[PDB]
């Protein structure tokens, strides 16, 4: 039943806010928290993401966290900013300076308890909490360092609940500082141990989509976040609307994660937008499996699919959907591991997203995701072999050994993905 949502740091709170805008519109919830929709399907699983307050008000089960106020002042002024519970805004003043150690060990530690108080108050009133979703980046300090601290503390207090992240992976193409690969390697180490499912949202891929496909010569954070929000709407459709398949976080984990560490998913979306032509079922299906539609910059032809979830939204022929899903599997059979039979599952939901008649969302557990980790690993090493920029971290009490261990664990994750690809 209930999911608790947490958004941390600049990136986490920006994508987080858009997520709540997009799903509040799909469920007919306006910025005051009033329902003004046309269909009982909108309210039937509303409690998964929204609490009900007095006056038939729907309030997101959402906690907003940062070490600086700036992005959270912007959240509060944003279009849906009034819908959040005021007590669920938990902010420090210090900032974290793009420094994972500040987020995880010094500044974040000072604030983490007050975040947990709010987590506990939301959790306490859940009829049957399924677990948590966190939105954050891995390249900064607060979402990366403080976010992974939160995950660890949440696990200690709710060890039998599911932990899910939407984790934005850094790229030099859309880069704020040189230390991003350090912060991401340190964070991946945490995610490998302490999440059950992680959607790898790669800024490399979002940028390439905006540039190559959508023809945006200069992509902003807003253009990248349009892709992120459509993806997030798509991958949570099964949690939010009535349906058979992957209807809660645990069942999704059980279908998607054959070995506990290999829980890093490559999302995709079709059609790609920033337009009037009807998209056919064959076209959605080909495009949702296309490298160019993937939100992690990994070539899926360089690996194999362990498991896949496909979600189609809109009024369309279920027969045609089944036939096309079967067609892609039959013609591309070598890219689906033979030792997990029937490893592709398909859901269809009648309610389309805003501004589209038809859409498809793709969630892949592919061994090609190793490309993402290798790219981060190479950027990490190029610096770390000269100990460049380390004083930012050792000044917060960290040793070099902790960097060596994180790098080694992420190289092990890469070797494991490679083992199942060769099996």
């Amino acid at each position: 039943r209930e999911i608790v949502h947490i958004q941390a740091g600049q990136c986490g709170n920006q994508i987080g806010a858009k997520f709540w805008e997009v799903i509040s519109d799909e469920h007919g919830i306006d910025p005051t928290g009033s329902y003004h929709g046309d269909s009982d399907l909108q309210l039937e699983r509303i409690n998964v993401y929204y609490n009900e307050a007095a006056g038939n008000k729907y309030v997101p089960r959402a906690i907003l966290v940062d070490l600086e106020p700036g992005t959270m002042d912007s959240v509060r002024s944003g279009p849906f900013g009034q819908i959040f519970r005021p007590d669920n805004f938990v902010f420090g003043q210090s900032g974290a300076g793009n420094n994972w150690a500040k987020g995880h060990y010094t500044e974040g530690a000072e604030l983490v308890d007050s975040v947990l108080d709010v987590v506990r108050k939301e959790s306490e009133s859940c009829d049957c909490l399924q677990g948590f979703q966190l939105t954050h980046s891995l390249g900064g300090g607060t979402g990366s360092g403080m976010g992974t601290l939160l995950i660890s503390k949440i696990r200690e207090e709710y060890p039998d609940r599911i932990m899910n992240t939407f984790s934005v992976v850094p790229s030099p193409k859309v880069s704020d500082t040189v230390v991003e690969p350090y912060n991401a390697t340190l964070s991946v180490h945490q995610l490998v141990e302490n999440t059950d499912e992680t959607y790898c949202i790669d800024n490399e891929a979002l940028y390439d989509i905006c540039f190559r496909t959508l023809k945006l010569t200069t992509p902003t954070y807003g253009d990248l976040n349009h892709l992120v929000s459509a993806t997030m709407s798509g991958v949570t459709t099964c949690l939010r609307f009535p349906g058979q398949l992957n209807a809660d976080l645990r069942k999704l984990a059980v279908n998607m994660v054959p070995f506990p560490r290999l829980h890093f998913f490559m999302p995709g979306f079709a059609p790609l937008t920033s337009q009037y032509r009807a998209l056919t079922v064959p076209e959605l299906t080909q495009q949702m499996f296309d490298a160019k539609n993937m939100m992690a910059a990994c070539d899926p032809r360089h690996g194999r699919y362990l498991t896949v979830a496909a979600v189609f939204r809109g009024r369309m022929s279920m027969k045609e959907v089944d036939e096309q899903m079967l067609n892609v599997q039959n013609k591309n059979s070598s890219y689906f591991v033979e030792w997990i039979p029937n490893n592709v599952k398909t859901a269809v939901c009648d309610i389309p997203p805003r501004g589209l008649k038809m859409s498809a969302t793709f969630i892949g557990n592919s061994t090609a995701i190793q490309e993402l980790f290798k790219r981060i690993s190479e950027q990490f090493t190029a610096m770390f072999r000269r100990k460049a920029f380390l004083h930012w971290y050792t000044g917060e009490g960290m040793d070099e050994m902790e960097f060596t261990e994180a790098e080694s664990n992420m190289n092990d994750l890469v070797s494991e993905y490679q083992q199942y690809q060769d099996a």
Binding site: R1, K251, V254, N255, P260, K319, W339, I340
Partner: protein, 437 residues
């Protein structure tokens, strides 16, 4: 008269249960409020339909049934639906959190905390019976609750009611409507743990029903509602002998006697004809010979497999509607000269035949056309082991890599239970081979 208690476990078991009880009400003239104007004994009786329904002093006819699920949403539809007045609230049991497609979570983790409540509620039904025969248990192989909770329950029912027969109606997994990759695991784990506790199990392969719905009912993409209305007709054909006057399969014990001479080999194949679409505006009605001959076609079986390449240990033909023995015997004589019907050497070559004169009832606004005669064949054929082979192969492919095993181990099951279960299935496939080939 001797009572039968129906137990419906998990989503599949519950939704099939809804379809079955709806159909039983229509067959017996019981209204959705439970009143039965044709029953002239108010507040009791030992009629044949009382095997499945008790009676209150106010004239309400109450299914002898328990519905159990580990999450509430499917059972809540029964509580709020058309037949809600039919059931006492204590017959409808739900938890808050499901088994997440994991046998171990149904059997060990959640099953340990609801099992005493479920047995208590079953006991309440048993205490109202004057001669309880036993239980009919409806569940999926593939779901966490249908697999794991059912096996726990069956074990406990052998302990608490050791003299009593237990029959199953079991839904075998098909990828066209399946909701989990680990269904082969759950199927083998439940089949292993349940095998000694079940006297007779009717397997329904969702693939076969699905295809019958597409081919014969012209349904483009069958839903559970389509599948379950057809399944409920087959179930009704099988249980009709417990609910109406007759001299064949009149008690649970007789199902085993007539269909299961070898106790582990207790999976009869059901084949049903005719299935004809209600939208079909010109239907030429099918004769006894045609419907009987259709019983030997794989396309009409509840499990796709080829009985020509196994051996029969028993065959029962259950007719409904305008059918007399003379036409049955002439149809059978024709079929013997045309088909590969080979019995094992230690059983006689023969058919037990039951005829009920009332044609099949259908649910108004359903997919099935009303027909003047129908038949369900129940054959214990070794060919059904083809289904075990398919499932066992899928299990082996995943288990060789230990794919998904950590989900089961994290629920406190030992890895050893996997290979113990698999070896019991290897011995089962072997038994079927030794009898059949």
């Amino acid at each position: 008269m001797r009572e039968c208690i129906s137990i419906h476990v998990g989503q599949a078991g519950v939704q099939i249960g809804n379809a079955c009880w709806e159909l039983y009400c229509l067959e017996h003239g019981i209204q959705p409020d439970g009143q039965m104007p044709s029953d002239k004994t108010i507040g009791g009786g030992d009629d044949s339909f009382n095997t499945f329904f008790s009676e209150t002093g106010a004239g309400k006819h109450v299914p002898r049934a328990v519905f159990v699920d580990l999450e509430p949403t499917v059972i809540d539809e029964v509580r709020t639906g058309t037949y809600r007045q039919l059931f006492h609230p204590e017959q409808l049991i739900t938890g808050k959190e499901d088994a997440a497609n994991n046998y171990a979570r149904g059997h060990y983790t959640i099953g340990k905390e609801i099992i005493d409540l479920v047995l208590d509620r079953i006991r309440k039904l048993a205490d109202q019976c004057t001669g309880l025969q036993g239980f009919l248990v409806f569940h999926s192989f593939g779901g966490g609750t249908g697999s794991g909770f059912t096996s726990l329950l069956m074990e406990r029912l052998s302990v608490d009611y050791g003299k009593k027969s237990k029959l199953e109606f079991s839904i075998y997994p098909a990828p066209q409507v399946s909701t989990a990759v680990v269904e082969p695991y759950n199927s083998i784990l439940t089949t292993h743990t349940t095998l000694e506790h079940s006297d007779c199990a009717f397997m329904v392969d969702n693939e076969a029903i699905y295809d019958i719905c597409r081919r014969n009912l012209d349904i483009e993409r069958p839903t559970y509602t389509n599948l379950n209305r057809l399944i409920s007709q087959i179930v009704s054909s099988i249980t009709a002998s417990l609910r109406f006057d007759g001299a064949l399969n009149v008690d649970l014990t007789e199902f085993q006697t007539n269909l299961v001479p070898y106790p582990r080999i207790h999976f009869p194949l059901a084949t049903y004809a005719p299935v004809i679409s209600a939208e079909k505006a010109y239907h030429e009605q099918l004769s006894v010979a045609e419907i009987t001959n259709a019983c030997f076609e794989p396309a009409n079986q509840m499990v796709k497999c080829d009985p020509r390449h196994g051996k029969y240990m028993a065959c029962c033909l259950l007719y409904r509607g305008d059918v007399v023995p003379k036409d049955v015997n002439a149809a059978i004589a024709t079929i013997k000269t045309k088909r590969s019907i080979q019995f094992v050497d230690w059983c006689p070559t023969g058919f037990k035949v039951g005829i009920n004169y009332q044609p099949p009832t259908v649910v108004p606004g359903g997919d099935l056309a009303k027909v003047q005669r129908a038949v369900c064949m129940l054959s214990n054929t070794t060919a059904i082991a083809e289904a075990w082979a398919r499932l066992d192969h899928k299990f082996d492919l995943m288990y060789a890599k230990r794919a998904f095993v950590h989900w089961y181990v994290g629920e406190g099951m030992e890895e050893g239970e996997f290979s113990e279960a698999r070896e019991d299935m290897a011995a089962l496939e072997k038994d079927y081979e030794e009898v059949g080939v």
